[PDB]
Write an enzyme that holds these catalytic residues in place. Structure first.
Site, short mmCIF file in Angstrom:
data_model
loop_
_atom_site.label_atom_id
_atom_site.label_comp_id
_atom_site.label_asym_id
_atom_site.label_seq_id
_atom_site.Cartn_x
_atom_site.Cartn_y
_atom_site.Cartn_z
N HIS A 1 0.99 -1.16 0.00
CA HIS A 1 -0.19 -0.48 -0.11
C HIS A 1 0.86 1.65 -0.25
CE1 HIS A 1 0.35 -0.24 4.71
NE2 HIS A 1 0.56 1.12 4.30
N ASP B 1 -0.60 -7.92 1.74
CA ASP B 1 0.46 -6.74 1.92
C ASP B 1 1.72 -6.70 2.00
OD1 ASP B 1 1.21 -3.31 1.19
OD2 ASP B 1 0.23 -3.89 3.36
N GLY C 1 3.22 6.04 8.61
CA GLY C 1 4.75 6.31 8.12
C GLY C 1 5.78 5.59 8.27
N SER D 1 4.58 1.34 7.22
CA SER D 1 4.62 0.85 6.60
C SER D 1 5.66 0.41 6.00
CB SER D 1 3.60 1.44 5.53
OG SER D 1 2.07 1.13 6.40
N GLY D 2 5.95 -0.98 5.74
CA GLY D 2 7.13 -1.13 5.12
C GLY D 2 8.15 -1.80 6.55
C1 LIG Z 1 1.12 2.49 4.52
C2 LIG Z 1 1.40 3.08 6.13
O1 LIG Z 1 2.20 3.65 6.78
C3 LIG Z 1 0.89 3.01 6.97
C4 LIG Z 1 0.85 2.40 8.53
C5 LIG Z 1 -0.47 2.09 9.39
C6 LIG Z 1 -1.31 3.58 9.72
C7 LIG Z 1 -1.77 3.62 10.67
C8 LIG Z 1 -2.22 3.10 11.94
C9 LIG Z 1 -1.04 1.64 12.00
C10 LIG Z 1 -0.36 1.29 10.85
N1 LIG Z 1 -1.11 1.68 6.77
C11 LIG Z 1 -2.05 2.22 6.34
O2 LIG Z 1 -2.18 3.79 5.92
C12 LIG Z 1 -3.04 1.36 7.10
C13 LIG Z 1 -3.79 0.91 5.39
N2 LIG Z 1 -4.19 2.41 7.57
C14 LIG Z 1 -4.66 1.59 9.00
O3 LIG Z 1 -4.36 1.30 9.57
C15 LIG Z 1 -6.35 1.87 9.04
C16 LIG Z 1 -6.65 2.82 8.35
N3 LIG Z 1 -6.88 1.28 9.02
#
Ligand SMILES: *C[C@@](*)(O)[C@H](Cc1ccccc1)NC(=O)[C@H](C)NC(=O)[C@H](C)N
Length: 224
Positions: free
Chosen positions: A41, A83, A174, A176-177
């Site tokens: 994502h 993912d 921020g 993710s990954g």
């Molecule tokens: C993509 C990545 O940055 C993010 C990680 C994250 C953000 C918010 C809370 C925990 C982890 N992942 C997402 O944006 C993901 C789809 N968000 C969700 O938690 C959804 C909105 N419930």
């Protein structure tokens, strides 16, 4: 990262950052000289990868651009299952003391195992605050049977959960990954949770890596 602290310098040589110009977008890990692993994502038309430093903007870090990316075919833009995504660097990353390859799993770790997750994500929520130095925090893997009591349908066999009871320790915008390492090998990559971040008893959901090492290996070869 929420309710964490700055990671000890040089302890995460396989951690990277995906930027859009100069603004943090996501995180990731270095598989090898020309391959980065991260969240699907976090897809972008073009990336500016940051390697070799816990401080964003460090004059000693390596900045490499990547145009190609490969998502697991089974990924879903709706459920976010499977993912994970592979990013190919336009040029080989120079391995050094601050830049190394992550140790992929060869086995799946059970519930209870302590882990650590890192990132440059916001350290607050709903309010936003992006740090310049990499943050760390310890969490424990949660059994699929316990995590389901919280997310129910929102969980597939390829998802792993972690966190601490009645604690805000978790990942956020921020991160993710980013890598979740337990007992030496990469066990997962940050994926999703609830918002505002850090809600007590709301586990952080990761991509369980012990089930995609064959896909990671075949994909790299296929496009090697
Ligand atoms: C993509 C990545 O940055 C993010 C990680 C994250 C953000 C918010 C809370 C925990 C982890 N992942 C997402 O944006 C993901 C789809 N968000 C969700 O938690 C959804 C909105 N419930």
């Amino acid at each position: 990262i929420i309710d964490g602290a700055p990671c000890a310098r040089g302890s995460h040589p396989w951690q990277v950052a995906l930027l859009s110009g100069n603004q943090l977008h996501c995180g990731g890990v270095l598989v090898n000289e020309r391959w980065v692993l991260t969240a699907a994502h976090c897809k972008m038309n073009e990336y500016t990868v940051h390697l070799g430093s816990d401080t964003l903007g460090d004059r000693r870090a390596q900045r490499i651009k990547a145009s190609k990316s490969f998502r697991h075919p089974g990924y879903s833009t709706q459920t976010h299952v499977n993912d994970l995504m592979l990013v190919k660097l336009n040029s080989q990353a120079r391995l050094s003391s601050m830049v190394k390859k992550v140790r992929l799993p060869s086995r799946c770790e059970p519930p209870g195992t302590t882990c650590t997750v890192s990132g440059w994500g916001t350290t607050t929520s709903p309010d936003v605050t992006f740090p310049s130095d990499l943050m760390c925090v310890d969490v424990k893997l949660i059994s699929p049977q316990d995590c389901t009591k919280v997310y129910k349908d929102l969980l597939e066999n390829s998802m792993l959960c972690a966190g601490i009871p009645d604690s805000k320790k978790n990942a956020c915008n921020g991160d993710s990954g980013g890598p979740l390492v337990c007992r030496g090998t990469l066990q997962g990559l940050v994926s999703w949770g609830t918002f505002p971040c850090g809600q007590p008893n709301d586990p952080g959901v990761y991509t369980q890596v012990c089930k995609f090492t064959k896909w990671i290996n075949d994909t790299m070869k296929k496009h090697r």
